[PDB]
């Protein structure tokens, strides 16, 4: 519980080693990031301010 | 490269049930034991100076025991907001209710010294009763349930009433203690307990103000583990109050006899 | 020459015991009577709009018939200050009590009328019993007992006490109905029948503070006479108000139903 | 009981026919008097403010 990311990094990610999406909660957090969850099971938080996490989020299936 | 989220410790949550159910139930059970123990003046307890204000501070406890358990988590969903409302209101006012008790008679102990005050002593007890009901406005209108456990409510429409709500913790829980320690071993009665027991709550009431407005800022996981392992580090040391205050008052009573 | 000096009427005094204690257990009887059948859902009761605030008032009503007797003339000696204090406390903390509750469900209806809210309920409840409790400190700091009556008190300090009590009584008895009326019937809902219970007890109030402090004068004997009948009637009418009041509410809740 | 008198005068009074002696409380009432009660069932109020009266007060056995 109280999920936070204080060191979100905007690299580039590959496409297909994820396996589900999440968003955040900022209770407590300082700024904002967003939380993936990839195949291998190992959970990931990025910046969401990048052009490359926004295709990704855009390429997302989220239904 | 990691750059794994953050995870909270996350300790008072569901599999700490016994400490709250079986310490409300322990809290309850001493704090009427010492209600009834002045409530029956058979064993030589009316002779103690200015014993109400020890009842009402012993009533007081018994109010916080009783109601420790309907905020606490462990408990299923079908919590209303307004049961959690109740719990945050009387629970807070009770803490507010004994330290004012407190601060009322550590600087009128002399006016306590000419005996038995009726008109003192009663507008002194139900005025402050009046204002400890009047100060936990803002923490029971900031009151909600998320999912039905209870949490305080940090939100742009309630930023005013968690303010005031913050400041007047802070002032009550540990700038009246201290302020009553001012003057700049110790010498004053050894019912700082009460206030002992009280600071965590209001020393880091103010950092999780500070953190929940987004004026300051956190470094890292570290950061965030400490404070809120500090938090329910602080709601223990208050929660077990229930239990702590009526032994001190017995003890005080039994001494200075 | 007559010249014969005015001997007070002196209605209310001992001779007149029933209309204190038949009035204090009819009150009571009837206030825990329209609260016990609140209390059990079975009577159809739930679906009242705004019902706390009914029980509130009931609750109110109730406490005022307790405090009935214990204050009342024809009784002998043997009370102290203690209880003509607390019998002063609690009746005005009652009355003032009552009359907020009304000015809450008149000027909040509103507010009530999203149904039971449990914040909203819950802090104006407990703010408004706080607020009462706190008002009714100058007449419980201000009261006493001469042989074993309870009377008020007008010394040559306790003059600003009681000016400050006499202008909360001014206030919130008669301002504060004729200023919820002073849009300037269709509106004024049969419950302000309370305060016709109380604005005697407020303009008599008055009158005697101004008669008290000395700044008034009396010109003629009948002026005494006539300020001592009226004192004794408002007060006769403001002990009414035990009864009056849980038939009030019993009457709205089966008319408006 | 709760006894007052607004128009007190200040006359003479019989030495002999008074009976005892008396105080009024001024709770209500305005110029403070004095209260006399005489042997024949008569209760009067009188000026403080004269000679008499101060005379009536000393000469009183109240003893």
């Known amino acids: 519980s109280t999920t936070c990311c204080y060191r979100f990094i905007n690299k580039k990610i590959p496409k297909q080693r994820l396996e589900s999406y999440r968003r955040t909660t900022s209770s407590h957090c300082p700024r904002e990031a967003v939380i993936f969850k990839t195949k291998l099971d190992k959970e990931i938080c990025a910046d969401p301010t990048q052009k490359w996490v926004q295709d990704?989020?855009?390429?997302?299936?989220?239904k | 490269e990691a750059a794994a989220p953050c995870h909270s410790c996350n300790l008072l949550?569901?599999?700490?049930?016994?400490?709250?159910?079986?310490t409300s139930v322990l809290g309850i059970l001493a704090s009427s034991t010492v209600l009834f123990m002045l409530f029956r003046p058979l064993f030589r307890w009316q002779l103690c100076p200015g014993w109400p204000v020890l009842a009402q501070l012993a009533v007081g406890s018994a109010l916080f025991?009783?109601?420790?358990?309907?905020?606490?988590?462990?408990?299923?969903?079908?919590?209303?907001?307004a049961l959690c409302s109740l719990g945050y209101c009387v629970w807070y006012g009770s803490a507010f209710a004994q330290a004012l008790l407190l601060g009322c008679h550590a600087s009128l102990g002399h006016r306590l010294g000419a005996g038995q005050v009726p008109g003192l002593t009663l507008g002194l007890?139900?005025?402050?009763?009046?204002?400890?009901?009047?100060?936990?406005?803002?923490?029971?209108?900031?009151?909600?349930?998320?999912?039905?456990?209870?949490?305080?409510?940090?939100?742009?429409?309630?930023?005013?009433?968690?303010?005031?709500?913050?400041?007047?913790?802070?002032?009550?829980?540990?700038?009246?203690?201290?302020?009553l320690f001012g003057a700049k071993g110790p010498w004053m009665n050894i019912?700082?307990?009460?206030?002992?027991?009280?600071?965590?709550?209001?020393?880091?009431?103010?950092?999780?103000?500070?953190?929940?407005?987004?004026?300051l800022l956190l470094s890292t996981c570290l950061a965030q583990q400490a404070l809120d392992l500090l938090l329910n580090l602080a709601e223990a040391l208050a929660i077990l109050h229930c239990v702590a205050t009526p032994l001190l008052l017995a003890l005080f009573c039994h001494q200075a006899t």
Not at chain 2, 69 to 75: D, N, S, T
Not at chain 2, 129 to 151: F, I, K
Not at chain 2, 196 to 213: A, E, K
């Open chain 2, 191 to 215: 019912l700082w307990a009460w206030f002992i027991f009280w600071w965590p709550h209001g020393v880091v009431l103010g950092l999780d103000f500070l953190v929940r407005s987004k004026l």
């Open chain 2, 65 to 81: 025991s009783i109601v420790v358990p309907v905020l606490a988590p462990g408990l299923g969903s079908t919590r209303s907001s």
């Open chain 1, 56 to 62: 990704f989020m855009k390429h997302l299936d989220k």
């Open chain 2, 13 to 22: 949550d569901d599999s700490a049930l016994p400490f709250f159910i079986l």
């Open chain 2, 125 to 179: 007890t139900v005025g402050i009763w009046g204002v400890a009901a009047l100060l936990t406005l803002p923490v029971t209108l900031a009151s909600g349930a998320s999912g039905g456990l209870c949490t305080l409510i940090y939100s742009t429409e309630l930023k005013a009433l968690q303010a005031t709500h913050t400041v007047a913790c802070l002032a009550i829980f540990v700038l009246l203690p201290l302020g």
